[PDB]
Design a protein around this ligand. Structure first.
Ligand SMILES: O=C(O)[C@@H](O)[C@H](O)[C@H](O)[C@@H](O)CO
Length: 300
């Protein structure tokens, strides 16, 4: 019948990735719940903009929604908790933190300081280091040029480990690897697959150095314009999408390694104790005083 608005939702994954399917599901549910009054247009592959630019757009009023997580720490320091290296043990552990009082504090700081509102969270598989030569311990890095996202803690940690990390938008990584500007990057297997990093990297080093969650978010200025009933619909759609996305994540854990191996990637076992010890030291040396007690608790 009537269509009152169309929310633009951007993310960095491709159309087979769990996040995309979840974003589509969110849109379907929200449309149903609002009798078509609120439509969602999904923009994959950073086609709406790079992550940092979408966050700025949400603040300025030009972007409605995105999938974003620890890059929010550039505005809300507590958001670094989404992705502390070696902190979270499992999906269940992360669900507890993200859904508990610590998670509520993180949510409120993101709203206040970044002017974006998390409405759902998606747990992720572990990040792994990819490279052109095997990397079995920190000693192997030897100044290796690598990409990290726009996440200050990741710059701190990877520098301390012995690499030379440069922050870059996700959609620029493939060409940067292809052109030899950087030699490696780090991400969960689902995103290595999504971005076809198998075409420009030889090795997946199983560092498993970060287990993290990420948020589906709506601009606080968009949220503010919605009626209470429509806010409720957004939350309900988001909850449905979250349950759906978890299933897709679990499916991907069964298949993504095999797929990447079929595309020629070699998986490398690492000296986990060495990586863990060195990374935890670097985290503690660089963590904001604001979240230090929580990190010390997680590391205990
Ligand atoms: O490497 C990336 O860019 C992605 O894994 C995510 O965007 C990253 O985890 C953070 O920027 C999420 O805010």
């Amino acid at each position: 019948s009537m269509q009152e608005m169309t929310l633009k939702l951007g993310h960095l994954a491709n159309e087979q990735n769990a996040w995309h399917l979840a974003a589509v599901k969110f849109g379907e549910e929200l449309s149903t719940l609002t009798d078509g009054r609120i439509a969602v247009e999904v923009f994959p592959n950073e086609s709406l903009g790079k992550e940092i630019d979408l966050i700025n757009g949400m603040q300025l009023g030009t972007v409605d929604m995105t999938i974003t997580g620890e890059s929010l720490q550039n505005w809300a320091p507590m958001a670094a908790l989404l992705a502390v290296p070696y902190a979270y043990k499992s999906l269940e552990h992360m669900d507890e933190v993200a859904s508990g009082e610590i998670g509520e504090q993180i949510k409120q700081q993101i709203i206040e300081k970044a002017q974006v509102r998390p409405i759902a969270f998606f747990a992720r598989g572990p990040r792994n280091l990819t490279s052109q030569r095997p990397i079995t311990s920190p000693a192997d890095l030897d100044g290796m040029k690598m990409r990290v996202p726009n996440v200050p803690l990741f710059v701190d940690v990877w520098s301390a480990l012995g690499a030379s990390p440069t922050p870059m938008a996700f959609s620029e990584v493939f060409t940067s690897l292809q052109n030899g500007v950087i030699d490696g990057q780090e991400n969960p297997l689902a995103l290595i697959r999504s971005a076809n990093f198998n075409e420009v990297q030889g090795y997946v080093n199983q560092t498993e150095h970060v287990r993290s969650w990420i948020y589906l978010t709506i601009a606080e200025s968009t949220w503010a314009k919605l009626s209470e009933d429509d806010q409720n619909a957004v939350m309900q759609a988001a909850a449905t999408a979250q349950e759906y996305e978890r299933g897709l994540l679990l499916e991907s854990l069964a298949e993504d390694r095999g797929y990447l191996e079929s595309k020629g990637m070699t998986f490398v076992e690492v000296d986990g104790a060495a990586f863990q010890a060195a990374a935890k030291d670097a985290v503690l040396a660089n963590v904001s005083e604001e979240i230090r007690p929580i990190v010390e608790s997680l590391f205990s």
